[model samples]
Target: MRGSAHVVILGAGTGGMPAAYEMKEALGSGHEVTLISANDYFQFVPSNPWVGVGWKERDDIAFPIRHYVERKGIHFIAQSAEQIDAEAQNITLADGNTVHYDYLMIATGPKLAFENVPGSDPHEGPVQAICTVDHAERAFAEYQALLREPGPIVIGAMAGASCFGPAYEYAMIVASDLKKRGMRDKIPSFTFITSEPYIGHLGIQGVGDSKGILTKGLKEEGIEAYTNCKVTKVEDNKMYVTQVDEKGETIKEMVLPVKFGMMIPAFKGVPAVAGVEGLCNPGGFVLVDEHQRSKKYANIFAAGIAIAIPPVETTPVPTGAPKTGYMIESMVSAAVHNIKADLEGRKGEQTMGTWNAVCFADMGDRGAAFIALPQLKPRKVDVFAYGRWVHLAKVAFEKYFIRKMKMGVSEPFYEKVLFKM
Candidate 1:
């Protein structure tokens, strides 16, 4: 009674691309696999910080998605989904075309919630971002403007933000880049601020010694650190920040004079994915079970930043856990396996993603790498280390991952081994 099913994956970023390749490979030539994405090119998002500083260019990190997926038995559509009719099991694209699916993989990622914070929009003046390739390019332009008129700089993640590693990386990378150009002294001040209660909470609580390591790194870079911090407002030349205590009470307020800055915005699921009732949490993140399948809809599965992950522990200002690249890979793999099982007309033990995380925060000249065995506390194998080798490895990983995607491979053995370790 096994019948070929149409599997549609909506996205082509860190999660969707690999999910398409994996699903197609698993289903062979029987099931139909289609990937719908807004962008034609796939950018290695982890390398976006380097792009923000001009250390890396767009072409170095991004490649055409259609070019690689062609002839790979996966139909690729360069269209963004405008609506998801979950009850009808169909999606409407931006061009008003509808595509039906027997199984839907929602890896559409999150919508950057910049409006949640006053004067924090990257599109506005005085604030820049590197969440996407386009954002990174604009950020580089801002960096150039800073070079022409150097001033104090403040960089951090906003409250209700999930991804904190990039904030830390960008601050260090900017410091390293400035020092390399002998412009560090021209900057009046450098500050690292965050909503995390401590210096290196990183939104998943601290990985082993992350506090000590990141605090030391910032100190060595001569950058001031502000923890449990919130930016109340931002102007063209100054920012209003408040430092809070463990109980979320304001301990002190600050008016930081600055010329350039970047703040990671909070994240929520995309409208197309969130619009469906009973499909998402209040924050618009998908509600998934152990197999990464939607709890309310058996045919719907979600992974990556679109899915909900509670904070490891509530912090003073509010933060959420990050869904790292490897962790997303695990989620995609589990979902693909479960879909394959369903397509085979059999219900066996459900597969579950390890949810382990291995993250690299690449500074310009050095980097920090951390591992969370289960991506939550009270788990085994929590470790962190930093060195120049990490920077090299990060670069190598970018090249290798891009190559893997180009070749249409999925879940490389070495990747599993490395993350498992």
Candidate 2:
């Protein structure tokens, strides 16, 4: 058990795919690296909205990852991780296969908590979602049907939703798509409702005039907002909510009528990685230090939605900050280095991870790029830029990322240069 160490990565999502390559490259022939995932393909998550809106196809966003990872001298296991026996330092697949690791990197993304709200449960209701490729496809099919049956639409985030970019992106994309379909006027009304203290609060408490820019953009596109809010319930064609002030006192109660809708739900740690005595939080997100190493279990590290960070400030209703793509890259980079240091006693410069927030939100034509160095406030950087060119930049970004994953490339180019993306 103590020769050259074997490190196993969980979930080949945004975080694991990159971590696998980087760790293999850094660890070299002295260690074993195996990538375990429930699926054989890696799905590009950021561009999921375009897939949902029918602007892109599934084949365009997903790539078979087995060949890619194996060709890079890494073992790939396509199985659902059923349980994490932290004490045993191994994982069991649903089929009873086991993987032991000297180190474990958890990138198991979130468990979409749609059941937290009534009537909006994806398995039970017509309420639409775009969290995954299949989810996006279904939403688009219903979207086509609704184009012929236009009515009041509610495109918003549910109470306590953390990832708000997609919710806002879908609303704007829907508006633009509707206008192109010649159903803009037929839409009785459209609302962008969320539990944010205000528009563009984005659960990080607003990054660089997101409030003003987003409010202006929405108003110009005939979109209204329901912020400082909570959704009490959702029905087949309606959503119920309560509005509050900064102090958390409810002021108004209302119902929103809708013919088609897309709402981003809150996320929790997936079940496989949840409920471990010293490894998880109340919501099941892994507990880790600045280096992405689990506080209680040094051999375990987590990135992406698998790890939890506190909210910037509590809202009237619950909402958490987003862990964007760039942020996850930082976490993965640090985890790879820390693992190498632990196993081989090879020290590296990136002992700690940077948790910045950089996101390019595409609004169909033009897009906005938001950056907040360190992800909290009172930092050295807080900037926002807008242009139609951002849309092109985002498209290029998607292709660049997909190509990197396919080619088994590791080490984030932007991070290596120590410059902005």
Candidate 3:
């Protein structure tokens, strides 16, 4: 649309990093590319819950942003995008600077909303969250303190929560920790309450009998679960819950004791630039088509958790896309291809049909591995339970991922290896 077409990518997290690297590689050295992020470091979000449990350190999950961006030969801006002018095609930064671009990619991830639940703010009380690196460290401290004096544990997500993997992972990890320390019995009770209709719904319904497998696995491990329940409010040491029966009547209202708890929060779109119409939905998430391109703005693309697509099934709560590593990478690839086509005066179809997800659910001593295809309609093909090996793999993945990020390399091996069959 203008001189040489500058490309500006917002956010340097999971989705942003890969999209920046891929787009730069695709466009070569011809066009100007800049990457902007609020934080100077990229944190491995999946392992954050482990950091919360004191099993990993904060540094273990973060890598310097400059290392990767500089290596890729793209300009880096360490500031948050404050506003956007869609018509003029420019974004304002928190530092009072503006960047103009012919093509823009919004990869700014989801906003955490702890305020949606009553008495859930981190500033006020003892509640801890594993969403951010800082929050994970704080949660780790709380978890360590609880270890000295064992007590009740409650872990679940509130209504409309979509990200459910971490909640399930943390619960099993905590359970395994107590078991290893010979204090499993000392911990009075462990309960999981969620908005899903059943265990392992994972906000996507069951993935090829995952509900049965997960239910049995948790039962064997002595972890209790309650489904179809809504968390009304959370106070200091108790969670007020309301469970509705099949008849749509409130079956019960109970206050469950909670000494240590982690709840996955719902996500909302980051504030769009003022007067930027047609970029976002009513819920604030960027309204992108199947190609990950904004419906109204052809030059703009979105990836990861920021691309707002409604859930496939109707449940008690709303759900969002499971933006795992593979799924996000596919989005990045599609965005790069489309951007390149735009630059070259060619029209290419953006597709992520080959993308799949391979998720490992660690159950302390033993763990389970799940493989899903297409991501939207997850089809689990392999399920394995192993002792010690899974734990070693989890640890190895953390080190490997951090090292890869530091080297500015993002691969989809998990999906590649699993989906080869």
The stretch of ten residues in a row with the least summed lDDT in candidate 1 is: 410-419
- Deviation in Å, model 3, residue 61 alpha carbon: 1.9
Please write out the lDDT profile of model 1 over residues 270-378, one tens digit for every residue.
8888899999999999998888889999999988899987655778887888888877877888888888888877752555556676789777567889888776677
Question: Candidate 3: which pairs clash?
Answer: 84-273
Instruction: Report the C-alpha lDDT of model 3 over 147-224, residue by residue, as the tens digit.
Output: 888788888777777777788888778877877888788878888877777888776555666788778867876888
Screening candidate 1 with a backbone cut-off below 3 angstroms (N, C-alpha, C), the clashing residue pairs are none
Model 2, span 1-421: residue lDDT tens: 4879898999899999999999999888878899999888899998888888899899999988888888888999999998888998878898998888888999999998887788887656667899888889998987887887777788888887888878878888888888887778987888888888889888777888888988898898899898977887887567888999879898999898867778899899988999677788988999888888899997899998899887667888889888888778888888988888777666534644556777887876789888887766786788878999889889888888888898876576454334355
Evaluate model 2: give its TM-score.
0.95
Q: Which lDDT value does model 2 have at 184?
A: 88
Ranking by lDDT: 1, 2, 3
* CA lDDT of every candidate: 0.86, 0.84, 0.75
Of 2 and 3, the candidate ahead on TM-score is 2
lDDT of 3 at 138: 81
Poorest stretch of ten by lDDT in candidate 2: 412-421
What is the C-alpha local distance difference test score of candidate 2? 0.84
